[PDB]
Design an enzyme around this catalytic site. Structure first.
Site, PDB file in Angstrom:
ATOM      1  N   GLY A 148       1.182  -1.947  -3.181  1.00  0.00           N
ATOM      2  CA  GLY A 148       1.006  -1.321  -1.850  1.00  0.00           C
ATOM      3  C   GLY A 148       1.695   0.028  -1.664  1.00  0.00           C
ATOM      4  O   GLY A 148       1.813   0.535  -0.545  1.00  0.00           O
ATOM      5  N   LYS A 179      -2.089   2.617  -1.884  1.00  0.00           N
ATOM      6  CA  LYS A 179      -2.312   3.588  -0.812  1.00  0.00           C
ATOM      7  C   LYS A 179      -3.161   4.786  -1.182  1.00  0.00           C
ATOM      8  O   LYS A 179      -3.884   5.295  -0.345  1.00  0.00           O
ATOM      9  CB  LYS A 179      -0.982   4.080  -0.247  1.00  0.00           C
ATOM     10  CG  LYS A 179      -0.224   3.051   0.558  1.00  0.00           C
ATOM     11  CD  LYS A 179      -0.939   2.723   1.882  1.00  0.00           C
ATOM     12  CE  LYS A 179       0.012   1.994   2.871  1.00  0.00           C
ATOM     13  NZ  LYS A 179       0.489   0.651   2.368  1.00  0.00           N
ATOM     14  N   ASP A 258      -0.566  -1.050   8.332  1.00  0.00           N
ATOM     15  CA  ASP A 258       0.723  -0.411   8.195  1.00  0.00           C
ATOM     16  C   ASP A 258       0.607   1.135   8.140  1.00  0.00           C
ATOM     17  O   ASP A 258      -0.386   1.695   7.667  1.00  0.00           O
ATOM     18  CB  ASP A 258       1.489  -0.997   7.013  1.00  0.00           C
ATOM     19  CG  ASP A 258       0.813  -0.734   5.694  1.00  0.00           C
ATOM     20  OD1 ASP A 258      -0.360  -1.141   5.543  1.00  0.00           O
ATOM     21  OD2 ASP A 258       1.460  -0.111   4.815  1.00  0.00           O
ATOM     22  N   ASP A 259       1.627   1.807   8.649  1.00  0.00           N
ATOM     23  CA  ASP A 259       1.620   3.279   8.786  1.00  0.00           C
ATOM     24  C   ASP A 259       0.276   3.969   9.139  1.00  0.00           C
ATOM     25  O   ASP A 259      -0.301   4.749   8.351  1.00  0.00           O
ATOM     26  CB  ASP A 259       2.426   3.999   7.678  1.00  0.00           C
ATOM     27  CG  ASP A 259       2.249   3.383   6.308  1.00  0.00           C
ATOM     28  OD1 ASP A 259       1.092   3.079   5.919  1.00  0.00           O
ATOM     29  OD2 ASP A 259       3.264   3.245   5.606  1.00  0.00           O
ATOM     30  N   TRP A 355       6.458  -8.936   2.775  1.00  0.00           N
ATOM     31  CA  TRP A 355       6.156  -7.793   1.967  1.00  0.00           C
ATOM     32  C   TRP A 355       7.512  -7.159   1.700  1.00  0.00           C
ATOM     33  O   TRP A 355       8.041  -6.439   2.561  1.00  0.00           O
ATOM     34  CB  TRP A 355       5.271  -6.845   2.761  1.00  0.00           C
ATOM     35  CG  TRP A 355       5.008  -5.473   2.148  1.00  0.00           C
ATOM     36  CD1 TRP A 355       5.917  -4.625   1.599  1.00  0.00           C
ATOM     37  CD2 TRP A 355       3.748  -4.797   2.093  1.00  0.00           C
ATOM     38  NE1 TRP A 355       5.310  -3.480   1.171  1.00  0.00           N
ATOM     39  CE2 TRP A 355       3.974  -3.551   1.472  1.00  0.00           C
ATOM     40  CE3 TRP A 355       2.449  -5.119   2.528  1.00  0.00           C
ATOM     41  CZ2 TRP A 355       2.945  -2.618   1.254  1.00  0.00           C
ATOM     42  CZ3 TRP A 355       1.428  -4.205   2.302  1.00  0.00           C
ATOM     43  CH2 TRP A 355       1.690  -2.963   1.666  1.00  0.00           C
ATOM     44  N   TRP A 356       8.081  -7.416   0.524  1.00  0.00           N
ATOM     45  CA  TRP A 356       9.452  -6.981   0.238  1.00  0.00           C
ATOM     46  C   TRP A 356       9.463  -5.647  -0.490  1.00  0.00           C
ATOM     47  O   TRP A 356       8.973  -5.569  -1.612  1.00  0.00           O
ATOM     48  CB  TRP A 356      10.184  -8.041  -0.594  1.00  0.00           C
ATOM     49  CG  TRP A 356      11.671  -7.756  -0.853  1.00  0.00           C
ATOM     50  CD1 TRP A 356      12.278  -7.624  -2.065  1.00  0.00           C
ATOM     51  CD2 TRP A 356      12.705  -7.563   0.138  1.00  0.00           C
ATOM     52  NE1 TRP A 356      13.627  -7.373  -1.900  1.00  0.00           N
ATOM     53  CE2 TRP A 356      13.914  -7.336  -0.560  1.00  0.00           C
ATOM     54  CE3 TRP A 356      12.720  -7.555   1.547  1.00  0.00           C
ATOM     55  CZ2 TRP A 356      15.146  -7.133   0.100  1.00  0.00           C
ATOM     56  CZ3 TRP A 356      13.937  -7.330   2.202  1.00  0.00           C
ATOM     57  CH2 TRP A 356      15.142  -7.140   1.472  1.00  0.00           C
ATOM     58  N   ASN A 357      10.028  -4.604   0.135  1.00  0.00           N
ATOM     59  CA  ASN A 357       9.998  -3.228  -0.466  1.00  0.00           C
ATOM     60  C   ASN A 357      11.097  -2.940  -1.524  1.00  0.00           C
ATOM     61  O   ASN A 357      11.944  -2.053  -1.391  1.00  0.00           O
ATOM     62  CB  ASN A 357       9.920  -2.145   0.626  1.00  0.00           C
ATOM     63  CG  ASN A 357       8.531  -2.065   1.287  1.00  0.00           C
ATOM     64  OD1 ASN A 357       7.490  -2.017   0.603  1.00  0.00           O
ATOM     65  ND2 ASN A 357       8.511  -2.058   2.628  1.00  0.00           N
TER      66      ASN A 357
HETATM   67  C1  LIG Z   1       4.342  -2.419   4.921  1.00  0.00           C
HETATM   68  C2  LIG Z   1       4.976  -1.173   4.275  1.00  0.00           C
HETATM   69  O1  LIG Z   1       6.144  -1.198   3.867  1.00  0.00           O
HETATM   70  N1  LIG Z   1       4.162  -0.109   4.199  1.00  0.00           N
HETATM   71  C3  LIG Z   1       4.522   1.176   3.562  1.00  0.00           C
HETATM   72  C4  LIG Z   1       5.858   1.735   4.068  1.00  0.00           C
HETATM   73  N2  LIG Z   1       5.920   2.279   5.293  1.00  0.00           N
HETATM   74  O2  LIG Z   1       7.073   2.833   5.834  1.00  0.00           O
HETATM   75  C5  LIG Z   1       6.901   4.109   6.281  1.00  0.00           C
HETATM   76  O3  LIG Z   1       5.770   4.485   6.621  1.00  0.00           O
HETATM   77  N3  LIG Z   1       8.010   4.898   6.337  1.00  0.00           N
HETATM   78  C6  LIG Z   1       8.020   6.213   6.740  1.00  0.00           C
HETATM   79  C7  LIG Z   1       7.178   6.713   7.765  1.00  0.00           C
HETATM   80  C8  LIG Z   1       7.198   8.069   8.146  1.00  0.00           C
HETATM   81  C9  LIG Z   1       8.066   8.951   7.501  1.00  0.00           C
HETATM   82  C10 LIG Z   1       8.918   8.483   6.490  1.00  0.00           C
HETATM   83  C11 LIG Z   1       8.894   7.128   6.123  1.00  0.00           C
HETATM   84  O4  LIG Z   1       6.994   1.738   3.298  1.00  0.00           O
HETATM   85  C12 LIG Z   1       6.960   1.486   1.869  1.00  0.00           C
HETATM   86  C13 LIG Z   1       8.221   2.143   1.232  1.00  0.00           C
HETATM   87  O5  LIG Z   1       8.012   3.541   1.033  1.00  0.00           O
HETATM   88  C14 LIG Z   1       5.565   1.878   1.349  1.00  0.00           C
HETATM   89  O6  LIG Z   1       5.512   1.738  -0.066  1.00  0.00           O
HETATM   90  C15 LIG Z   1       4.537   0.981   2.014  1.00  0.00           C
HETATM   91  O7  LIG Z   1       3.250   1.229   1.460  1.00  0.00           O
END
Ligand SMILES: CC(=O)N[C@H]1/C(=N/OC(=O)Nc2ccccc2)O[C@H](CO)[C@@H](O)[C@@H]1O
Length: 585
Positions: A148, A179, A258-259, A355-357
């Site tokens: 993801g 993505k 997400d996002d 969903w563990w990052n």
């Molecule tokens: C569910 C999730 O964590 N979605 C995304 C995710 N979403 O978080 C953000 O969109 N963070 C963010 C938003 C705007 C500016 C900077 C960071 O974080 C992960 C770690 O980078 C991504 O790999 C994922 O695809």
């Protein structure tokens, strides 16, 4: 052999019941035609690989291997098991007994037989097998990986290797959601070209062979419409895109929110409920629909113990059959305490998906995340029945952290992150494991200096030793034995890194060569940092000045470099040494 090898995951109940025995050059095989097809092939492939022949006849007091499911009427199995059984284990559970020239594998179901065969594979070392009685089953029913992340998606070869790797460590879930695959997000409406489809077929097939649910994710969020006939056409586009994948055998699906900016909870969930009704239920053989809402971390979902407006409408609208993911207390966080799952699960009124990052590095790509699952409550299974990790764009080095995620989620209550982490690298790296531990040890803690922090601290024991050095020195005590010890550690870092550059497979090396050179640079600055201390203690102004310029260069090189490693240990030690003025009489 006599001794039980490293196994992954850690079997629920394992007991050594004898001395061990050497499997013969050809063996008696019982159960083949009646036992799980995928289990038998994996068994066959292992036999072929290790030059273990199969008797087309039977006796000559050869080793007997009996394989099967509880439901099959197999007397040799019953006898060979001798009272222990998979009869009462959960799905995917199995019983394995090796005793006195016999190995018996009994699955609860076909998945369990396959998993029994993986344990058999890990148990055999140079034809020697220990004598054990094992009953085994997972804590959590869904265990795996969500691709993801942002950045270059895994190659097709990468994915196939990953799938096999999942089967061997008993992970049963692969979510295809990168993505930056346009057919997944940016051009989510258009079907795959009639050859990316051929590659899809292989992914699907490999996942079937390895007991992994291939989950197809779609993220329509950017430009999907809901209102009027626009909304209808767009909805139709979901169905046709999902059917196109169903048609080649995809039986699990995800729709992700997400996002995106659009925070229209009711709109999102009705799309999900529409799809769940006209696609999932209508087809009859598709697994529970999976989603992630626009609010997906506790900070984004909750305000003072209560759901936010979006989260509230989403929770109250989305069908109970739908599986909802969240990432924990933050998008990239230290921990998921039992209390966080309790909270979110209470809001959605169900068992949640995680969903563990970690080990994902997309937000901070200079560092490789090479540590174990860390911070995840060992009772999370009380509110979670679905555990995935979001890995790095580096498929090969992701295996280390993935390996430990497989042990955490299969055997949660016994999970020991340090032991799991050591096992991962031992089982993955062989002869190179000790050198690999030296380097990966310095590369576990992820920290982007703002919103993203997770993972075991880098090199804690080395860090404690550095701390010990400063308080011995600032107390005016003799630190000479510690100084000498620390020389050994820094030399050792540089030599591990060099052995790795010289001896790592290219597939791992192409992923870490820059971070290797950087730890070398850092180790050399750490060495020069000790030189500074020693020169000061010795009142040699000259030797100090020379060492300081070296230490300061190595640090400056590290700071300017793309690669990032050991910020709080190898790197910060140099800043600590530069600022420590030991000459204040
Ligand atoms: C569910 C999730 O964590 N979605 C995304 C995710 N979403 O978080 C953000 O969109 N963070 C963010 C938003 C705007 C500016 C900077 C960071 O974080 C992960 C770690 O980078 C991504 O790999 C994922 O695809």
């Amino acid at each position: 052999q006599v001794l039980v090898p490293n196994l992954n995951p850690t079997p629920e109940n394992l007991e050594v019941v004898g001395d061990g025995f050497k499997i013969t050059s050809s063996i008696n095989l019982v159960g083949e035609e009646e036992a799980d097809e995928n289990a038998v092939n994996a068994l066959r492939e292992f036999l072929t690989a290790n030059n273990i022949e199969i008797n087309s006849e039977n006796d000559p007091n050869s080793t007997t291997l009996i394989i099967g499911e509880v439901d099959d009427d197999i007397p040799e199995l019953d006898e060979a098991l001798n009272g222990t059984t998979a009869e009462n284990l959960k799905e995917e559970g199995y019983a394995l007994v090796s005793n006195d020239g016999k190995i018996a594998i009994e699955g609860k179901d076909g998945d369990g037989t396959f998993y029994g065969v993986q344990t058999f594979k890990q148990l055999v070392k140079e034809s020697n097998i220990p004598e054990v009685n094992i009953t085994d089953y997972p804590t959590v029913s869904a265990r795996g990986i969500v691709e993801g992340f942002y950045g270059t998606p895994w190659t097709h070869q990468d994915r196939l290797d990953q799938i096999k790797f999942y089967g061997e460590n008993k992970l049963n879930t692969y979510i295809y959601a990168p993505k930056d695959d346009p057919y997944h997000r940016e051009k989510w409406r258009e079907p795959y070209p009639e050859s990316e489809m051929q590659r899809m077929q292989e992914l699907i097939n490999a996942s079937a062979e390895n007991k992994v649910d291939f989950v197809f994710g779609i993220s329509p969020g950017i430009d999907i419409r809901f209102d009027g006939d626009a909304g209808e056409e767009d909805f139709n586009h979901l169905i046709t895109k999902a059917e196109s994948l169903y048609d080649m055998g995809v039986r699990s699906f995800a729709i992700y929110w997400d996002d995106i900016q659009d925070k229209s909870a009711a709109k999102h969930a009705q799309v999900l409920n529409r799809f769940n009704e006209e696609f999932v239920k209508a087809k009859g053989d598709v697994k529970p629909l999976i989603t992630v809402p626009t609010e997906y971390d506790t900070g984004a979902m909750v305000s003072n113990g209560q759901p936010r407006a979006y989260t509230r409408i989403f929770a109250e609208t989305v069908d109970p059959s739908i599986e909802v993911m969240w990432t924990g207390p933050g998008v990239v966080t230290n921990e998921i305490p039992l209390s966080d799952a309790q909270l979110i699960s209470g809001i959605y009124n169900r068992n949640m998906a995680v969903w563990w990052n970690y080990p994902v590095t997309d937000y901070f790509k200079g560092k490789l995340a090479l540590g174990p699952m860390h911070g995840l409550d060992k009772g999370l299974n009380q509110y979670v029945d679905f555990f995935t990790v979001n890995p790095m764009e580096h498929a090969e080095l992701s295996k280390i952290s993935i390996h430990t995620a497989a042990d955490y989620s299969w055997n949660m209550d016994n999970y020991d992150y340090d032991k799991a982490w050591n096992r991962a690298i031992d089982m993955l790296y062989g002869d190179l494991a000790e050198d690999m531990k030296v380097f990966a040890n310095h590369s576990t803690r992820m920290d982007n200096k703002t919103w993203a922090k997770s993972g075991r601290e880098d090199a804690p024991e080395l860090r404690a030793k550095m701390d010990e050095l400063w308080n011995k020195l600032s107390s005016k005590e003799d630190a000479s034995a510690l100084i000498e010890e620390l020389y050994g550690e820094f030399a050792r870092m540089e030599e591990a890194c060099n052995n790795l550059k010289a001896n790592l497979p290219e597939v791992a090396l192409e992923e870490c060569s820059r971070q290797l050179d950087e730890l070398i640079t850092l180790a050399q600055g750490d060495k020069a940092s000790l030189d500074m201390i020693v020169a000061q203690l010795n009142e040699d102004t000259e030797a100090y000045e020379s060492a300081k310029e070296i230490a300061q260069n190595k640090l400056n090189t590290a700071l300017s470099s793309f690669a990032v490693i050991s910020e709080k240990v190898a790197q910060s030690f140099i800043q600590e040494a530069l600022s420590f003025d030991l000459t204040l009489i």
